Amino acid sequence: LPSPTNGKKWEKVEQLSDEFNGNSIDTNKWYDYHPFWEGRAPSNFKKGNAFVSDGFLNLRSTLRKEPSSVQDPFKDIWVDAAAAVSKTKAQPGYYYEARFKASSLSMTSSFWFRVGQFSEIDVIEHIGNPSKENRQDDLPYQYHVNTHYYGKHAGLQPLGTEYKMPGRGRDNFYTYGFWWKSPNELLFYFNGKQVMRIVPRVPLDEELRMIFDTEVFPFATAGVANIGLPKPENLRDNSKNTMKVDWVRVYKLVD
């Protein structure tokens, strides 16, 4: 963990931390779907595609139906995505870290915060294996952070940055850290080293929910590039279709 500030101690926030080592998801801590959003067409989150087993929260994306069986593969739903959403709220001041290996799909493998009135904080929205071939050289190595603004702050542009990792997200368990240090200062960490900083456009002083999810992007939107639609062949392969979170750990400072 970062050095705690000014004589304070880090204490684990138990309700937001999980080693994911049980036989099934802890329903006290997590929805195994997104209770307020069906997901990003042509994907929709499916209950239980986020499941705990084998030491992981597994966020699996599967084929609902062939893309050739729907009228428009960019819109009609054909991918069953995965989401887990926290039941306890994420707060300013906490440190958050998740150790995960991305899927090998042309979909996100994401760790982020939303379910707010005006703000979103993205720790990482990793594109494990873009089907847009000319992005295969860069996106698999990218750790991209972001902030979004909506509601009373609609119209502000996102504000984020990125870090080039030494290996692909789909090939490695890496530990992505985020200190919500102030409403006006976000610090991001890669394997315990500070690598990025964002000063949000307005103070991020509302509570949010923590999210792990997977999404198809039918085109560039929501701060994510044009990545291409996923391939059925990969969606059918359980060795390629699953983002695996070994653990998430959250801490707060106590006086």
Residue 101 or 126: the one with the smaller Cβ distance to Ca ion is 101
Residue 172 burial (CB count, 10 A):
14
CA neighbor of 241 nearest in space, from 82, 33, 19, 32:
82
DSSP letter at 142 equals E
Secondary structure of 236-251 as H, E, C letters: CCCCCCEEEEEEEEEE
Which residues are known to be catalytic?
Answer: 120, 125
As measured in angstroms, the least distance from the Cβ of 21 to Ca ion is: 5
Choosing among Cl ion, Ca ion, none, which partner's interface includes residue 55 (Cβ < 5 to 8 Å by kind)?
Ca ion
State the Cα–Cα distance between residues 105 and 133, nearest whole angstrom: 12
Strand residues in 69-166 grouped as ranges (E): 79-81, 83-86, 95-101, 108-114, 119-127, 142-149, 161-164
Out of 93, 222, 231, 253, the residue judged to bind Cl ion by CB under 5 A: 231
Whose tokens are 């400072």? That residue is 253
As measured in angstroms, the least distance from the Cβ of 43 to Cl ion is: 12
Residue 125 marked ligand-binding = yes
Regarding 19 and contact with Ca ion (CB under 5 A), the answer is yes
- Rg, Å, the chain Cα set: 17
Residue 63 or 156: the one with the smaller Cβ distance to Cl ion is 63
What tokens appear for 240 in the block? 């390629």
Out of 2, 55, 92, 93, the residue judged to bind Ca ion by CB under 5 A: 55
Give the residue at shortest CB distance from Ca ion: 55
Regarding 204 and contact with Cl ion (CB under 5 A), the answer is no
Range in contact with Cl ion (rule: CB under 5 A) among 137-145, 202-210, 229-237, 241-249: 229-237
Out of 18, 20, 135, 211, the residue judged to bind Ca ion by CB under 5 A: 20
Chain residues binding Ca ion by CB under 5 A are 19-21, 55, 246-247
Which residues are annotated as part of the binding site for substrate? Answer: 37, 40, 115, 120, 125, 215
